[PDB]
């Protein structure tokens, strides 16, 4: 049933309310997602002026329901099976030798639009570090996100390291711990072990005055033998 909502192009709305070392900010975005091809695009706008953290640190917080699951892996798509009622996606993101984010998102259908509504809190960041100091490049590396079942909570879990390029020429690791839990309580698909393959391109709208990020992701489930 849930997969039947993702046979075409689906409109997206993203809303984030954030607070990092007490600095409050708000992000609003809309775009389109195409789970048949495992593709999505968003224009994400800061509605509160210049962001207090670099846009790349927010990429993972700002839609796993749009992964393309190959035809032989269809019974392992927890994310679509939880729709239309949706799921809660919660993370801790720990920045190497710096502070951490905690996020709670709700991913669900409102009308015919897929909404990702997020509350983010960032704690213990250093004023001269890479995040509050804006020393991260405006780009994004490709990553594999391994997905496991969480029977106890009727959901899935994931942990993965994000590599952020630093302006000097190094890398800063962002350690992600993730838990997804259904919002309703209909049956969902609990998956065998697999991973999602992510590729992301960050860009800018040359005609937009506000602080913003154009995000294009391509996502493919993989890792199940036959």
Author numbering: 3 to 64, 68 to 231
Text from the published report:
Our structure-guided screening efforts produced a YFP, hfYFP, whose stability in notoriously chaotropic conditions, including OsO4, allowed it to survive CLEM sample preparation with fluorescence retention matching mEos4b’s. hfYFP also showed strong resistance to aldehyde fixatives and performed well in ExM. The spectral properties and performance of hfYFP in cells —having similar excitation/emission maxima but lacking eYFP’s 405-nm absorbance peak —make it an appealing replacement for eYFP. hfYFP exhibits faster chromophore maturation, fluorescence intensity in Escherichia coli equivalent to mGL’s and greater than the other GFPs/YFPs tested, 33% greater brightness than eYFP and 2.4-fold greater brightness than eGFP in three human cell lines, greater pH stability than eYFP and insensitivity to chloride. Intriguingly, instead of dimming, hfYFP grew 50% brighter in 6.3 M GdnHCl. The data provide further evidence that hfYFP is stabilized by GdnHCl even at concentrations that rapidly denature common FPs (and almost all known proteins). When measured after 12, 24 and 48 h, hfYFP fluorescence was unchanged relative to its value at 2 h. Whereas sfGFP denatured instantly in 7 M GdnHCl, hfYFP persisted >3 months in the same solution at room temperature (RT) (inset photograph). The melting temperature of hfYFP (Tm = 94.2 °C) was approximately 20 °C and 14 °C greater eYFP’s and eGFP’s values, respectively. hfYFP and mGL can tolerate higher temperatures for much greater lengths of time than the other FPs, including sfGFP. We tested the same FPs that we compared in the other stability assays and found that none could tolerate OsO4 concentrations used for CLEM except mEos4b, hfYFP and mhYFP.
We report the rational engineering of a remarkably stable yellow fluorescent protein (YFP), ‘hyperfolder YFP’ (hfYFP), that withstands chaotropic conditions that denature most biological structures within seconds, including superfolder green fluorescent protein (GFP). hfYFP contains no cysteines, is chloride insensitive and tolerates aldehyde and osmium tetroxide fixation better than common fluorescent proteins, enabling its use in expansion and electron microscopies. We solved the crystal structures of hfYFP (to 1.7-Å resolution), a monomeric variant, monomeric hyperfolder YFP (mhYFP) (1.6 Å), and a cysteine-free mGL variant called FOLD6 (1.2 Å), shedding light on structure–function relationships underpinning their brightness and stability. Through structure-guided engineering and screening based on GdnHCl unfolding kinetics and melting temperature (Tm) alongside rigorous spectroscopic characterization, we produced a series of avFP mutants demonstrating superior stability over sfGFP in diverse biochemical assays. Each FP crystallized as a monomer with no asymmetric unit.
